[PDB]
Amino acid sequence: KPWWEDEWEVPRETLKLVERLGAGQFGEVWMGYYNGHTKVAVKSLKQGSMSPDAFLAEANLMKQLQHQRLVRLYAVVTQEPIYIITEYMENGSLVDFLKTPSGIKLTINKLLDMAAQIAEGMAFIEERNYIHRDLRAANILVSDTLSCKIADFGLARLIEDNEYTAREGAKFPIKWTAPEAINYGTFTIKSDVWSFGILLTEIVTHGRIPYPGMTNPEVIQNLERGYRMVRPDNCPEELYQLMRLCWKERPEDRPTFDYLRSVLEDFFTAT
Numbered sequence: 572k573p574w575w576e577d578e579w580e581v582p583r584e585t586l587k588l589v590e591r592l593g594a595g596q597f598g599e600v601w602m603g604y605y606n607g608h609t610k611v612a613v614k615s616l617k618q619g620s621m622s623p624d625a626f627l628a629e630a631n632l633m634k635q636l637q638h639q640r641l642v643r644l645y646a647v648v649t650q651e652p653i654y655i656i657t658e659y660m661e662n663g664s665l666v667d668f669l670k671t672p673s674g675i676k677l678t679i680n681k682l683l684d685m686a687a688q689i690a691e692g693m694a695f696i697e698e699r700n701y702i703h704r705d706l707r708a709a710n711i712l713v714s715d716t717l718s719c720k721i722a723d724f725g726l727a728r729l730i731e732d733n734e735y736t737a738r739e740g741a742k743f744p745i746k747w748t749a750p751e752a753i754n755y756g757t758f759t760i761k762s763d764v765w766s767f768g769i770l771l772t773e774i775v776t777h778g779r780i781p782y783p784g785m786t787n788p789e790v791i792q793n794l795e796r797g798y799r800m801v802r803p804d805n806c807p808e809e810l811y812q813l814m815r816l817c818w819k820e821r822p823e824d825r826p827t828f829d830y831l832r833s834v835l836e837d838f839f840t841a842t
């Protein structure tokens with residue numbers, strides 16, 4: 572709908588940027604207030620760093636994916652500098668939080684709890700015929716109550732047919748991406764499942780980079796041999812085996828996110 576009819580467009584005056592959370596090539600992300608009292612996250616696009624349409628494309632996908640487990644779109648300011656305002660998560664990115672004094676003290680019980688929360692969110696994405704493509708601990712945000720939500724929908728896509736095929740030149744993080752995606756550029760929800768497996772290692776190691784001591788080339792070589800990531804230190808065996816399911820050769824053999832959620836919930840209510 573046109574901005575003068577869109578429920579999400581808001582006057583820039585309603586926003587007060589207070590603290591910068593990140594700065595990059597394409598813009599910045601700030602902590603701010605909407606109408607003085609409501610804490611928000613404000614993403615600002617760096618003019619000319621990239622297409623405004625590309626930037627706003629994420630906010631429109633977000634309009635179609637609203638759920639408690641996904642960072643919620645709040646509003647947009649479609650006049651340069653373009654802004655996308657979203658729900659604020661007090662404890663930042665999961666990968667960072669797990670390294671703080673609080674994160675370090677978390678029990679395996681709570682880690683499994685968070686893992687399930689993430690699977691729950693992905694289960695919603697799964698059911699709505701969408702894919703994320705950037706599922707990693709850095710893209711999971713943590714609330715003041717230690718609840719987790721999926722974030723960063725820049726690469727997310729609505730899957731009209733079973734799969735999405737990227738651009739031959741498109742490149743992705745080798746360590747978190749499924750083989751079929753790395754090799755054919757083909758992404759499905761099953762590709763996200765593989766990524767979830769890697770994310771689980773990020774959780775249990777409190778933010779460590781996957782495939783410790785290995786380069787991307789080494790990771791690919793080993794995977795082709797049928798090897799999978801070595802058991803992380805102090806990783807419960809049941810969780811490791813759940814990770815293995817996520818890394819099955821055949822995408823169709825990998826479990827659904829609802830299955831993953833269900834199992835993780837049992838792991839949690841057991842510990």
Ligand SMILES: c1ccc(-c2oc3ncnc(NCCN4CCNCC4)c3c2-c2ccccc2)cc1
Nearest residue numbers: 592593600612658659660661662663664709710723
């Ligand atoms: C301390 C520092 C930041 C926050 C922090 O709180 C947040 N709430 C909502 N959204 C955010 N943006 C997610 C952006 N993704 C894309 C960029 N990488 C992270 C995820 C952030 C961030 C944030 C983290 C890292 C970089 C930018 C913004 C909270 C406490």
